[PDB]
Every structure is written in structure tokens, then in C-alpha cells.
């Protein structure tokens, strides 16, 4: 049995958002203008279902690779040979004479084999571009990293990252310069 797990986290990019005077998304600014001036729990809750609760003040834009590979193999082997023999002779006389003999014999042979195997792999990729990410995710993983496939995927990640880690401020700090903003 053999097992191999790989996890790699790569950070091709790393950004910080301003502290003040940010320019807001059109669809967000529309929903903030639409909200009632008096409190309603349902209508204001719907902002969190649509836009979430916090925004990234800094983070790492990255690619992630995860692989598990797991192999089991079993063999059984059998061989056997056998022989058995018995022989029985007699003479009687008194003119009259008789002489006799008899035999019984056996052999057996056996062979047997049983081979059994299981292989599993599980892999996740985040970030990159689907042709190279496919090429890397498709690796059964029996030897761990194939550095050619991995380095083509990492060159994809530089062109199309995914989020890996982050720092947060609440969405409510952004709601600035709309009508009735403070309210």
C-alpha cells in the first residue's frame, strides 16, 4: 500500500484597498439608493444576501493544488503436489499353488493465484485557466508533482488567480456619499 498527499498554496499577487474615497459598484450603489430611510429588517437584510457583510482591505491572489493518491495491492499464490501408494502381495500353496498382488495409487496437484488492487485519487485546483488546470487535475498523482504540468498551471495562475487569504472591513463602512448616507 502506498499513499501520497500534496497540498500547495501559491501567491502570485498581493493587493491593498484604499482607506477612503472608494468608488462603488453600480449595482451596489443602486441597491443603497433603493433602501428605505426608515428601518426595515427584511429590506436591509437583503443587502447581505446580495452583497455580503465585509470587503477585502488586503489579500493574496493565488492558486491552490490539492492531491491525494492512494494505492493498495494484494497478491496470494498457491502451489501443491501430492502422491500416495500402497501395494499388497500374497502366496498360498499345498499340488495347488496361487500367487497374487494388488496396488492402489493417487496423485494431486493444485495452483492458485489471486491479485487485487485499488487506486484512488482526489484533486482540487483553484486559480489558473481551464486547459492547464485540467491537465494538472487529471494527473493520477502516482509520482507526486509532474513539474512540467505544474509549471504550466502556475503560469496560468499568474494570468487568472483565485482568492487564498484576506483581511476584512464591514460593508457598512463603504456606504458613503449616497443620499441620506448617515441614516
Amino acid at each position: 500500500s502506498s499513499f501520497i498527499r500534496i497540498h500547495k498554496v501559491m501567491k502570485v499577487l498581493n493587493f491593498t484597498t484604499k482607506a477612503k474615497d472608494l468608488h462603488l459598484s453600480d449595482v451596489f450603489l443602486k441597491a443603497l439608493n433603493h433602501l428605505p430611510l426608515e428601518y426595515n429588517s427584511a429590506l436591509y437584510s437583503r443587502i447581505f444576501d446580495d452583497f455580503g457583510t465585509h470587503y477585502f482591505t488586503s489579500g493574496s491572489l493565488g492558486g491552490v493544488y490539492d492531491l491525494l493518491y492512494q494505492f493498495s495491492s494484494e497478491e496470494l499464490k498457491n502451489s501443491g503436489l501430492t502422491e500416495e501408494e500402497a501395494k499388497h502381495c500374497v502366496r498360498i500353496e499345498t499340488t495347488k499353488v496361487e500367487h497374487r498382488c494388488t496396488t492402489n495409487k493417487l496423485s494431486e496437484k493444485h495452483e492458485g493465484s489471486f491479485i487485487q488492487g485499488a487506486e484512488k485519487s482526489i484533486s482540487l485546483i483553484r486559480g489558473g485557466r481551464s486547459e492547464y488546470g485540467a491537465a494538472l487535475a487529471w494527473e493520477k498523482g502516482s509520482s507526486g508533482l509532474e513539474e512540467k504540468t505544474f509549471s504550466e498551471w502556475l503560469e496560468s495562475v499568474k494570468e487568472n488567480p483565485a482568492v487564498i487569504d484576506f483581511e476584512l472591513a464591514p460593508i457598512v463602512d463603504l456606504v458613503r456619499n449616497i443620499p441620506c448616507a448617515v441614516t
Binding site: 485557466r129 481551464s130 486547459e131 492547464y132 488546470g133 485540467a134 491537465a135 487529471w138
Partner: protein
């Protein structure tokens, strides 16, 4: 006297969604020497899916929530809501006496079809053999909801019997609450009129 036999059965069912039609027909074509599929063809498919994707995971909002900007919109919204509940009650698989061998069922309008799991077949899924990991037994199927109780103390109630089939031979029980209760319809009648 001497005798021998062989049987060999080889099956495979590649299924693909998304990607370009040529890449799909190339990748789904089964190499018996490499039945998982080839690195090159599969990577080409993964390129093409960037340009011909399909929705593969989704979160759902009920269709009545879109009734807007028409005459009678407020009333049409509630009647589409009740028609969804009536459609769900017409097509909910509880109307089907369930299939053997782990098969789900669907309502084909007036009719029940079994979706037999791999290499098991026939109308009840009685024929053939299963493949892969199994828990064994017969898992518990619901019978349909009993008809809704008439707004006693301002709320309806209904009950479901878990007896179609009853969980048997060690199979897992029916999933969901055995009973439900809800507010009445006076809000539609009074407020919208």
C-alpha cells in the same frame, strides 16, 4: 469429457456536459486501452468549456418571486405560489410505489418511471446487478402528505406516514419532518381585495 466457458462483459458510459461538440464527441469516445480518457483530448475539452459552459451548481428562488410589472401582479403572485404547490403535489415522487435496488422514481405526467442504478434494469429495477459501495437493506420512502387540516386556531397541519416502503432490512429511514404546520390564507383574501 471436457468443457469450458468464457464470459466477458465490458461496459462504459462516459458522460460530459459543457464544452464544444467536437471535443465532447472526442473525449466521450471510449478508449478500451485508457478508459478514464486521454490527457490531450481531456485538456482540449477543458479549454472548450471556457467558451461553451453549462450551469453545473445553482441556488434556487421560487418562480412566483418574479411576478412583477403586470396587471393583478400581487394576486397572480399568490396564485402562481399555490399552483407551484399543486404542481409539486402532482409530480412529487411520493405517488410512486418505489423501485427495488436503490432506484429513484419520477412522475411522467400520469405515470411512474424508475431510474435504475447502474447495470440493474427492468420496470421495477428487479433485473441485473448493482456496482460500487452499498449500505444494503431497503431505505424508507415517504407516502404523500395527508390533506391539509382546515385552519383550526389560525394554522393548518398535515402528516406523512413513512410507509412507502417502510425502512426495512437495515436501510436508512425517510428524511424530513413527519408533520408540518402553516398560517392561513385570510391575508390574500382581505388585503389584496
Amino acid at each position: 469429457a471436457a468443457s469450458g466457458t468464457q464470459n466477458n462483459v465490458l461496459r462504459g458510459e462516459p458522460f460530459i456536459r459543457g464544452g464544444g461538440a467536437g471535443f465532447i464527441s472526442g473525449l466521450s469516445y471510449l478508449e478500451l486501452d485508457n478508459p478514464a480518457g486521454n490527457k490531450r483530448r481531456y485538456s482540449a475539452w477543458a479549454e472548450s468549456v471556457t467558451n461553451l459552459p453549462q450551469v453545473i451548481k445553482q441556488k434556487l428562488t421560487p418562480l412566483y418571486e418574479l411576478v412583477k410589472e403586470v396587471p393583478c401582479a400581487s394576486v397572480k403572485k399568490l396564485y402562481l405560489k399555490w399552483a407551484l404547490e399543486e404542481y409539486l403535489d402532482e409530480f412529487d415522487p411520493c405517488h410512486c410505489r418505489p423501485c427495488q435496488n436503490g432506484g429513484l422514481a419520477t412522475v411522467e405526467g400520469t405515470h411512474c418511471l424508475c431510474h435504475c442504478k447502474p447495470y440493474t434494469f427492468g420496470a421495477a429495477c428487479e433485473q441485473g446487478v448493482l456496482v460500487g459501495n452499498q449500505a444494503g437493506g431497503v431505505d424508507g420512502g415517504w407516502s404523500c402528505w395527508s390533506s391539509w387540516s382546515p385552519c383550526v386556531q389560525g394554522k393548518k397541519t398535515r402528516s406523512r406516514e413513512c410507509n412507502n416502503p417502510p425502512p426495512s432490512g437495515g436501510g436508512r429511514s425517510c428524511v424530513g419532518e413527519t408533520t408540518e404546520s402553516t398560517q392561513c390564507e385570510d391575508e390574500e383574501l382581505e388585503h389584496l381585495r
